[PDB]
C-alpha cells in the first residue's frame, strides 16, 4: 500500500505545517502537525478541558463506531519549546492520504498547554520518530508509520515541505519526479529515539565549505534550524546589523536585509537553503527587526534540522531494518 497527503503551512511564515488525517468511523478529519521529532499521535478532543479549546477541530470518540478505550492507558508529553499535553487513549482507524491503519493508538487530550490552545490551526500531532519515545503508559504504543510499515510497498516515508507553499508527505514510495539529481543517504542513530544523523559541514552564502561533523536530528516538528553557536555566529556575521538579542531570545536582523543562503552537507552532497527561507518576519507586529531562522542550539543539548533546513530538500525517512535518511535537492 501507499499514502500521499498534502501538507500546508499554517501561516504566511511557515511557522508549522498541517496535514489532514481521517480518524474514526465515520471519518473525523483533523489537521495534524506531522512531527518526526516525537512519537505520539494526540488530538484535541471532546475530553479536552473546554477553556483550553479555542477553534481547534476535535475528535469525539463516542461518535466513532470503531473507537475503543484502551483500558488504563494514559499519556503525557513535554516538548522542547516548553509546551505539553496529556490525556487518555483510544484505538481507532486512522488514514493518511489513502493509507489506512486499524487499531492505531489515538491519544485524546484532557489537558493542553497555552501554546496549543492559542494555535487554532493545529488539531494535534502525529509523531513519526521511533516508537521507543512513545509516552503511553503502562503499555507503550506504536507510531502510525510503525503500524503501517509492513503493509507499505517500501518501508519509507518522505517529507517534501514547501516554502510559503504546500508540499507532500508520502508513505510507502519515493516519487522520483519530486526532486532533482540523486538522493544521498546517510547513517542514522536511533539511540535517542530520533532520526539522528551527522551533517558533513556547512557554507554561508558563496563562502567556502567548512568540513565539520554536525550531529543533529531531522525534525519536521521544529520550525527553525538550530546549530552550534560557532556556526550560527558565522552565518549572522554576514548580515549587516544582525545581533543576538537576549530579550527576544535569539538572533534578529534588520527586516531590510537581504539574507545569504546557508548550505549543509549530506555526505559529499550539498543542500542549499535560500536566504529568504531564513526570514521569520517582524519580532512583533510593526517592528523593523526580524527574527532569524537559524538559531543557536547551545543549551538545547542537540542540533535540530527543523523545517528551515528540511524544506530545502526532498527527505527520505527510510524505516528499513537499519534506518537511514536520504536527502535530495529539489
Alpha-carbon distances of 8 from 15, 121, 133, 225, 229, rounded to whole Å: 11, 11, 26, 19, 31
DSSP letter (8 states) at residue 147: H
Distance of CA 245 to the CA centre of its chain: 26
Our answer to whether residue 81 is catalytic in this structure is no
C-alpha cell at 13: 511564515
* Rounded Cα gap, residues 276 and 240, in angstroms: 15
Return the SS3 of 232.
Answer: helix
Q: Which domains does the chain have, with CATH numbers?
A: 5-174 (2.40.70.10), 175-330 (2.40.70.10)
Helix, strand, coil content of the chain in percent (nearest 5): 10, 45, 45
Residue 146, by phi and psi: left (phi above 0), alpha (psi -120 to 50) or beta?
Answer: alpha
Our answer to whether residue 199 is catalytic in this structure is yes
| CA angle 253–254–256, rounded 5-degree value | 135
**Which residues share a beta bridge with 150?**
none
Resolution reading in Å: 1.5
Residue burial 197-220, b: 16+ Cβ < 10 Å; e: rest: bbbbbbbbeeeeebeeebebbbbb
* Helix (H) / strand (E) containing 252: strand 250-254
Place of cell 510499515: 149
Task: Indicate which residue of 35, 40, 88, 123 is catalytic.
Answer: 35
Quick one: CA dihedral 104, 105, 109, 110, positive or negative? positive
Answer yes or no: are the C-beta atoms of 169 and 7 closer than 8 Å: yes
Answer yes or no: are the C-beta atoms of 36 and 220 closer than 8 Å: yes
Neighbours of 280 (CB within 10 A): 21
Cα dihedral 324, 138, 113, 26, rounded to 10, equals 80
DSSP letter (8 states) at residue 164: S
* Rounded Cα gap, residues 245 and 229, in angstroms: 14
Cα dihedral 147, 153, 159, 160, rounded to 10, equals -150
Place of cell 489537521: 31
- Comparing CA positions, the residue from 229, 274, 232 lying closest to residue 253 is 232
Half-sphere exposure of residue 68, counting CA atoms within 13 Å on the CB side? Answer: 8
Phi, psi of 71, rounded to the nearest 5 degrees: -60, 125
Return the SS3 of 175.
Answer: coil
Half-sphere exposure of residue 276, counting CA atoms within 13 Å on the CB side? Answer: 6
Task: Indicate which residue of 39, 85, 95, 199 is catalytic.
Answer: 199
- Comparing CA positions, the residue from 271, 251, 249, 253 lying closest to residue 262 is 271
| Complete edge-to-edge strand list for the sheet that includes strand 269-273 | 269-273, 262-266, 196-204, 210-218, 303-305, 225-227, 294-296
C-alpha cell at 176: 522520483
* Rounded Cα gap, residues 197 and 184, in angstroms: 13
Breaks (C-N over 2.5 A) in the chain follow: none
* Rounded Cα gap, residues 265 and 272, in angstroms: 9
Q: List the alpha helices (DSSP H) in 82-188.
A: 114-117, 144-148
* Rounded Cα gap, residues 114 and 111, in angstroms: 10
- Comparing CA positions, the residue from 162, 167, 127 lying closest to residue 7 is 167
Contacts by 299-302, CB closer than 8 A, 24 or more apart: 300/80, 300/226, 302/192, 302/194, 302/196, 302/215, 302/216, 302/217
Q: What are the residues whose beta carbons fall under 8 Å from the beta carbon of 21, sequence distance 6 or more?
A: 5, 29, 30, 31, 32, 94, 95, 96, 126
* Rounded Cα gap, residues 160 and 273, in angstroms: 14
Amino acid at each position: 500500500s501507499t499514502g500521499s497527503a498534502t501538507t500546508t503551512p499554517i501561516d504566511s511564515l511557515d511557522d508549522a505545517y498541517i496535514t489532514p488525517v481521517q480518524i474514526g468511523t465515520p471519518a473525523q478529519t483533523l489537521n495534524l502537525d506531522f512531527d518526526t521529532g516525537s512519537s505520539d499521535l494526540w488530538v484535541f478532543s471532546s475530553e479536552t478541558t473546554a477553556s483550553e479549546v479555542d477553534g481547534q477541530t476535535i475528535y469525539t470518540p463516542s461518535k466513532s463506531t470503531t473507537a475503543k478505550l484502551l483500558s488504563g492507558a494514559t499519556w503525557s508529553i513535554s516538548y522542547g519549546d516548553g509546551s505539553s499535553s496529556s490525556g487518555d487513549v483510544y484505538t481507532d482507524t486512522v488514514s493518511v492520504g489513502g493509507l489506512t491503519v486499524t487499531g492505531q493508538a489515538v491519544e485524546s487530550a484532557k489537558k493542553v498547554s497555552s501554546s496549543f490552545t492559542e494555535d487554532s490551526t493545529i488539531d494535534g500531532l502525529l509523531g513519526l520518530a521511533f516508537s521507543t519515545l512513545n509516552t503511553v503508559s503502562p503499555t507503550q504504543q506504536k507510531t502510525f508509520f510503525d503500524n503501517a510499515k509492513a503493509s507499505l510497498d517500501s518501508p519509507v516515508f518522505t517529507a517534501d515541505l514547501g516554502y510559503h507553499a504546500p508540499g507532500t508527505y508520502n508513505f510507502g514510495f519515493i516519487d522520483t519526479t519530486a526532486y532533482t539529481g540523486s538522493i544521498t543517504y546517510t547513517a542514522v542513530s536511533t539511540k535517542q529515539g530520533f532520526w539522528e544523523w551527522t551533517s558533513t559541514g556547512y557554507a554561508v552564502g558563496s563562502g567556502t565549505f567548512k568540513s565539520t561533523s554536525i550531529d543533529g536530528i531531522a525534525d519536521t516538528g521544529t520550525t527553525l534550524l538550530y546549530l552550534p553557536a560557532t556556526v550560527v555566529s558565522a552565518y549572522w556575521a554576514q548580515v549587516s546589523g544582525a545581533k543576538s538579542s537576549s530579550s527576544v531570545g535569539g538572533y534578529v536582523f534588520p527586516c531590510s536585509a537581504t539574507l545569504p543562503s546557508f548550505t549543509f552537507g549530506v555526505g559529499s552532497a550539498r543542500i542549499v537553503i535560500p536566504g529568504d527561507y531564513i526570514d521569520f518576519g517582524p519580532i512583533s507586529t510593526g517592528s523593523s527587526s526580524c527574527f532569524g531562522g537559524i538559531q543557536s542550539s547551545a543549551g538545547i543539548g542537540i542540533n535540530i534540522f527543523g523545517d528551515v533546513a528540511l524544506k530545502a530538500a526532498f527527505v527520505v525517512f527510510n524505516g528499513a531494518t537499519t534506518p537511514t535518511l536520504g536527502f535530495a535537492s529539489k
